[PDB]
Amino acid sequence: DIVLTQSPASLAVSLGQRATMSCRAGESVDIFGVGFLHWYQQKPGQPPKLLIYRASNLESGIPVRFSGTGSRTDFTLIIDPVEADDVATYYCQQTNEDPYTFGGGTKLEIK
Amino acid sequence: EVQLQQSGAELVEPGASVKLSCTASGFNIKDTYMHWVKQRPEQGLEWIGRIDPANGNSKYVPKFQGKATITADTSSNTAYLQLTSLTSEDTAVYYCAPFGYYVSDYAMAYWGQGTSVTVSS
């Protein structure tokens, strides 16, 4: 199955600063050029929440301070500016192929 | 709205079984694969498998075969996850999430609130 690796394991940022994080796939997750790589926000004690699908498409209701890039194997989630609501663990997931797999998470904290 | 309502926390002993429910509203579960995801405390998300409620066809990752049984009852728009011969490794929050063209076509946009299962004497 396609292993997803996220870095860093945790990140502490100041309110208003830029946060960026990595999701790398051990095999390509593209379908006709589009990465079937999605990003979820999991706030403490809550279920995951979809932020971005197919690498760079924001779900409606997600503010534009969130963005994503990437194709094939190397993906990036960007949050700028970071706001207090954004405390959470961020996960990438691929649905290019069964079984669906998830990265290990990047835990975002505000200092 | 699209909603997923999961059953309440469980506190059970080693060797027992539990059957968790995920009731959908706002859409027909026959329009969606119903997926189940495991999260141990302090840990990440793990896919268990899914059911197609339209025909009862499930898929299971090898490590959950014989452990997890996923079923559905379309007359009550509900999906189920049964876990047997429980050990402490089964202590986790379990989430359901639909995936399907007319409801959540790209990723998992909708999640139940999760059901915590605790396995201990």
Question: Which residues lie below 8 Å from residue A25, measured CB to CB, with a gap of 6+?
Answer: A2, A3, A4, A5, A37, A72, A73, A74, A75, A94
Domains of chain A: 1-111 (2.60.40.10)
Indicate yes or no: CB of A49 within 8 angstroms of CB of B111: yes
Write the CA distances from B65 to B54, B60, B115, integer angstroms: 21, 6, 20
Q: Which two tokens stand for residue B84?
A: 């047997």
Domains of chain B: 1-121 (2.60.40.10)
Q: How far apart are CA B36 and CA B109, in angstroms?
A: 14
The closest CB to that of A47, out of B59, B99, B111, belongs to B111
Structure determination technique employed: X-ray
CB B29 within 8 A of CB B36: no
CB B117 within 8 A of CB B12: yes
Indicate yes or no: CB of B111 within 8 angstroms of CB of A48: yes
Q: Is beta strand A106-110 parallel, antiparallel or unpaired with respect to A10-13?
A: parallel
Q: How far apart are CA B41 and CA B120, in angstroms?
A: 14
The closest CB to that of B113, out of A47, A102, A104, belongs to A47
The closest CB to that of A50, out of B95, B108, B114, belongs to B108
CA-closest candidate to residue B109, choices B121, B98, B120: B98
- Resolution of this structure in Å: 1.5
Q: How far apart are CA B90 and CA B33, in angstroms?
A: 23
Which chain A residues are within 8 Å of B61, Cβ to Cβ?
99
By CB atoms closer than 10 A (0-12, 13-18, 19+), residue B76 is exposed
Q: Which CB contacts under 8 angstroms, 24+ apart, belong to B22-25?
A: B22/B78, B22/B79, B22/B80, B22/B81, B22/B96, B22/B112, B23/B76, B23/B77, B23/B78, B24/B77, B24/B78, B24/B79, B24/B98, B25/B77
**Cα angle B4-B7-B9, degrees, rounded to a multiple of 5:** 130
User: For B120, phi and psi rounded to 5 degrees?
Assistant: -165, 160
Classified as helix, coil or strand, B88 is helix
Q: How far apart are CA B41 and CA B48, in angstroms?
A: 16
H or E stretch covering A3: none
CB B14 within 8 A of CB B119: yes
Question: Which residues lie below 8 Å from residue A51, measured CB to CB, with a gap of 6+?
Answer: A38, A39, A40, A41, A58, A59, A62, A66, A68, A77, A90
